[PDB]
Each structure stands twice: as C-alpha cells, then as structure tokens.
Design a protein around this ligand. Structure first.
Ligand code: NA
Ligand code: NA
Ligand code: NA
Ligand code: NA
Lengths: 211, 211
C-alpha cells in the first residue's frame, strides 16, 4: 500500500490502480513456506484486511492484489475469499505459484513472452496467447510485470502490443518498472553521482539490479 | 457418404473418419437459402439420417458431419440435435455459417490462417490461435480444410504444425486435398493426357480449380 496521497491523485488525475498488500516472501525455500503455514495467517491477514479497510472508497483502485512472490499457499486462498466476501466491487489478483491459481481472478503472469513458451516445472510461463486457451481456462490475462526495462531495454515491446490488440482476452500489462532505484552519493569534491547495490558497503548485494 | 467398402478398409487399416452428409448448397444466395427453409428439412433429414443408419457400426467413423458449404440454417440445428440424440458416441461437426455455430461440437474452419485474421463480415476466419480464446469459447479446433494443395503449393505448412503442437486445443486438420480431379483424354495419336474444366466443351466451367 502506498502513501495515502497517491490514491487521491490517481482518483483526480485518472489512473487505474492495482492496490497490493505488503506481503513478499521471495527468499523463502520454497517460496510458499510461510504462506502455506497457518501460523502465519494472522500476520498475512492484517496486511490484506487493513489495506482494504483503508483504501476501499477510492475509485482509482480497481483491482486488489494479495502481494507478490510469496508462492501459492492456503493463506492466499483464505484471504482471496475474505476480499471477495467483503468487497464484491473489485476483482482480486495474485501471481504467486504460477499466475493462474485459485487465488486469482486474472491470469497475471510476470515476464511471460508473447509467442515463446517457458515451460518451467510446476510454474510454467506459457506464451500469453497460448495461456488463454489452455483447456478449461476462461479468465482475462493482464501481465502484472513485463518488458523488463533494465538499462538499454524494451526490445520487442511492439510484439506485446500487437498481441494485446489482436486478442480480446489479452488486456495489457504493467511494465517493470517506472523509475530506477538509484541513490545519490557524493565524491571528494562534493559532486553527486548515481549509486546502486554495494555502493554503501552493503553486502551481500545485487548491484545494478535495482535500476 | 463414401462407397461402403471405404469404411471397412479404414476399420482394418486404421484411419479416423469424418462421415459427411451429401448436402452442399454452395451456389445459393445467400448460402443458407435452402438450409434455413423448413420445406427443405425433409430432403436434408434423409441425407443425414440414412447415413447414420448405414455407417453407425463402423469404428473408423469418429465424427459425423452435416455436410459442406450450405451456410447455417435452422435445418442444421434440428439435424445436429437428431444425431446427438440417436448417437451419443460421436461428436457432430459442421463448418457452415462461420465454423463455430450451434450446429457444431468442434470449431472446424476452412483455410483459417495460423496468425493472420481474415475478418469477413458475418463469417470471419480468425487466426486459429486467436479463435480458441474468444470470450466464452471452449471447443477444440480442427480445420475441416486447410493448406490448399493446388499445383505448386503447401507453402507455410510448417506454421500450422508448429501451432498444432504448441496449442493443446489445436488438434490438427484435414488438408485440401488428396488427389487432383483430372480426367484422361486422348489426342490424335491416341496418347493420353490430363484434362480439367472446359476440356470437354463444358461451359461455364472453372478450369484447373478441380486439381
Ligand atoms: Na486485447
Ligand atoms: Na529489480
Ligand atoms: Na494441439
Ligand atoms: Na477445387
């Protein structure tokens, strides 16, 4: 959840907002270790329910998200249902555990390609075109993350947009991401420069991957 | 319906057969002029019912077809239902009226392309990959006719097969077609040569389009 002013500005200027609970357990092995554990349901529930209680009157918020990169655990299903019950006005989405779980109203993969399949075990990233028509699948598809804009990037961006326009059920995506997470440091002469991971003596670090 | 021996041979040698009623009204304007007419329901019914009565015990027959290029009329819907009631063991397909009507269990277009839409009014031929995922669509897609093998042809054949293998619900198709419809004529020296439309003084005719 963002600073409260963000929603007011999105209401007034006009932007569709996905409001996302502060839950990410990416570094767990496996990713759902905490999210499939009922001992962690109370802490997770507060991050979801208190978001909804705060932001539910904002017209700019059109979709609730259960968080990010926390696998798919039973706690996700419980909290998916909680939202559906308390606020029927907004779809609920969540990408974890394969982007098309029972905890999402929208097929919301991250970095699924347009034409090329990436058949990872358990959590494949199918071509977005192929994903829509898998036996029994009926949901819309909007990428929660795509076209990773790191440095000299956005090659093949037009390929996504051609697909989006041709396929009714491909309804777009969210580019990753808006702004480089570089920080200002100062040299000997007091001149500013853009810094990334490791530049503060932080270790271990992931270097430029924050930009 | 074919010569009775054809089905015996397909039973014993092993080929899947689509058994198709002798109903084609292509030259009508519009194409469904007779098939939407209840006066023509009796004649149409006999061409469907008498085929099913004859061929229903052949294991090689796996799908029934209501005919070819007769648009989509209420007579098709009536006869689709007759077959489903009398023989639940086999799906029913029919391409007329846009390949995805209420008179077909299988999306069965003719010459729909792999990636390219052909958005004809009323009877569009969508990209096969796109067709599967149109809002609400759940049926398998098998082209009743594709890769028109006229003369020096079959360019782009590999594109269909790549798509068939990638997409579960793209379950193949039937090439058009097996054998040139050329006829033997003899010259002044009694030498045989291959003839087509117009070579018998038949007029009007469509020349080499039978090959
Ligand atoms: Na679209
Ligand atoms: Na990053
Ligand atoms: Na297939
Ligand atoms: Na022909």
């Amino acid at each position: 959840p963002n600073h409260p002013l963000w929603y007011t500005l999105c209401d007034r200027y006009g932007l569709y907002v996905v409001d996302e609970a502060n839950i990410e357990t990416h570094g767990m092995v496996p990713m759902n270790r905490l999210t499939d554990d009922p001992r962690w349901l109370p802490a997770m529930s507060e991050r979801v329910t208190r978001m909804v209680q705060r932001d539910r009157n904002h017209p700019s918020v059109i979709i609730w998200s259960l968080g990010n990169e926390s696998g798919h655990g039973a706690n996700h299903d419980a909290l998916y249902r909680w939202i559906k019950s308390v606020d029927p006005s907004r779809p609920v989405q969540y990408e974890g555990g394969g982007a098309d779980t029972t905890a999402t109203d929208i097929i919301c993969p991250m970095y699924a390609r347009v034409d090329e399949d990436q058949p990872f075990p358990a959590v494949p990233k199918w071509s977005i075109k192929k994903w829509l028509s898998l036996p029994g699948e009926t949901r819309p598809l909007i990428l929660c993350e795509y076209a990773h804009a790191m440095g000299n990037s956005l090659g093949g961006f037009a390929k996504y947009w051609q697909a989006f326009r041709q396929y009714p059920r491909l309804q777009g995506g969210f580019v990753w991401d808006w702004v480089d997470q570089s920080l200002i440091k100062y040299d000997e002469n007091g001149n500013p420069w853009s810094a990334y991971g490791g530049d503060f003596g932080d270790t271990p670090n992931d270097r430029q991957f924050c930009m």
